C-alpha cells in the first residue's frame, strides 16, 4: 500500500474538473543518482511507519562541496511488496522531474542495484514542523511577553517559515506537481532554520494516524483537504492552497490541531458546506489570518496562486531577511 501522495499533471481542462496525471511508469529511469552502496554509513531511525522507515546516514564521495556529509536514507520494510519498491522507483522518477530547490527535502542519490533500495535525502535535523513549534512553545511564549513589554523561537521565525513554505510550494506549482498532504507534519526544518517541505508518508502508520480519516481504500487528511478534494476527489495546485492555509493555522497556534475538539463526521462535513471557518489562532496577526481566510475560499480559482502567496508574505518580511534568504537559495542551487 505505500505510496507517495505527490501528482505531476499533465494536463488540465480549462474549467479545471478533468485532469490527467503523469503516470511515473511511463518515464524511464537514468541512473544520475545511482550511488554505491559502500559509500552510506547508516545510523539510528529517525521516523519508522506500516511499510518502511526513513534512517540517519552519512555519505561519503555522494557531494564534492561535503566529501564527507550527513544524510537521511529512506527504504522498505522487509516484507515490503513489489508494487511499492516500484513507488519508490516512482518517486525517484518524480524527484527527478521537479528538479531542485532550497524548500523541498531534496533527493541526493540512490541505491537501486544489488540490494535493497535506498533513497538518499537531505538531512533535517529539526524534524518535523509540528514537533519543532511543540517544543519551542514556552520560548515564543516568552518572546512574546517580553516584545509585549518592550536560540529561541519569535514570530519572525513563524513569517519565515510561512514564507519558505510559499516558495517551496510555488516551485511545486510551477511544475505542475500537486502535494495533496501539504500539513506541518510534512515540513520539516534543517539547520540554519531552512523548512523543506516532503512527504513524510514511508514512514508513518496511516492506520493509527488520527490525522487520517479512511474513506474506502485509503486515508484521507481531511482536515487539511479543500472542499472539492473532500467531496468530489479534486486535487489541483488549488486544492494545495486551501492546505497551505489550515498549515498556516498550525503554524501559528504553535502547532494546534485544525478545527480543535472537532471529529471528522457528517456534522463536521455539513459544517465546511455551510461556509464554516476555523477563528484565528492565537499568535497570527491579523495580517497573517487574512492569508489564510484567501486561501479558504469555497471557490478554487478564487485562491491566491503560491506566486502570489510568497510576494504578499515578502511585504511582511523585513527586506534584508529576503535578501539572506535570496543568498542562501543561491548558495544551496551552487552547492557541489
Not at 154 to 174: C, I, K, N, P, W
Not at 224 to 243: G, H
Request: net charge neutral; proline share 5%.
Amino acid at each position: 500500500r505505500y505510496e507517495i501522495r505527490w501528482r505531476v499533471i499533465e494536463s488540465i481542462s480549462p474549467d479545471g474538473h478533468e485532469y490527467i496525471y503523469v503516470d511515473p511508469m511511463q518515464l524511464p529511469y537514468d541512473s544520475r543518482w545511482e550511488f554505491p552502496r559502500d559509500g552510506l554509513v547508516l545510523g539510528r531511525v529517525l521516523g519508522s511507519g506500516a511499510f518502511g522507515k526513513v534512517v540517519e546516514g552519512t555519505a561519503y564521495g555522494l557531494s564534492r562541496s561535503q566529501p564527507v556529509m550527513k544524510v537521511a536514507v529512506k527504504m522498505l520494510k522487509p516484507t515490503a511488496r513489489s508494487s511499492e519498491k516500484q513507488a519508490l522507483m516512482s518517486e525517484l522518477k518524480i524527484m527527478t522531474h521537479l528538479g531542485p530547490h532550497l524548500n523541498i527535502v531534496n533527493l541526493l542519490g540512490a541505491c537501486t542495484k544489488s540490494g535493497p533500495i535506498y533513497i538518499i535525502i537531505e538531512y533535517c535535523f529539526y524534524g518535523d514542523l509540528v514537533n519543532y513549534l511543540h517544543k519551542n512553545r514556552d520560548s515564543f511564549l516568552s518572546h512574546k511577553k517580553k516584545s509585549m513589554l518592550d536560540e529561541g523561537l519569535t514570530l519572525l521565525d513563524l513569517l519565515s517559515f510561512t514564507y519558505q513554505v510559499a516558495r517551496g510550494m510555488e516551485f511545486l506549482a510551477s511544475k505542475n506537481c500537486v502535494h495533496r498532504d501539504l500539513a506541518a507534519r510534512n515540513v520539516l526544518l534543517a539547520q540554519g532554520k531552512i523548512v523543506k517541505i516532503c512527504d513524510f508518508g514511508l514512514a508513518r502508520d496511516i492506520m493509527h494516524d488520527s490525522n487520517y480519516v479512511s474513506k474506502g481504500s485509503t486515508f484521507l487528511p481531511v482536515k487539511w483537504m479543500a472542499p472539492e478534494s473532500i467531496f468530489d476527489n479534486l486535487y489541483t495546485t488549488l486544492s494545495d492552497v486551501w492546505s497551505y492555509g489550515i498549515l498556516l493555522w498550525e503554524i501559528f497556534s504553535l502547532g494546534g490541531t485544525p478545527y480543535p475538539g472537532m471529529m471528522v463526521d457528517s456534522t463536521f462535513y455539513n459544517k465546511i458546506k455551510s461556509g464554516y471557518r476555523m477563528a484565528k489562532p492565537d499568535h497570527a496577526t491579523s495580517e497573517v489570518y487574512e492569508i489564510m481566510v484567501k486561501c479558504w475560499n469555497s471557490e478554487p480559482e478564487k485562491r491566491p496562486s503560491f506566486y502570489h502567496l510568497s510576494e504578499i508574505v515578502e511585504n511582511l518580511l523585513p527586506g534584508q531577511y529576503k535578501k539572506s534568504y535570496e543568498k542562501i537559495h543561491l548558495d544551496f542551487l551552487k552547492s557541489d
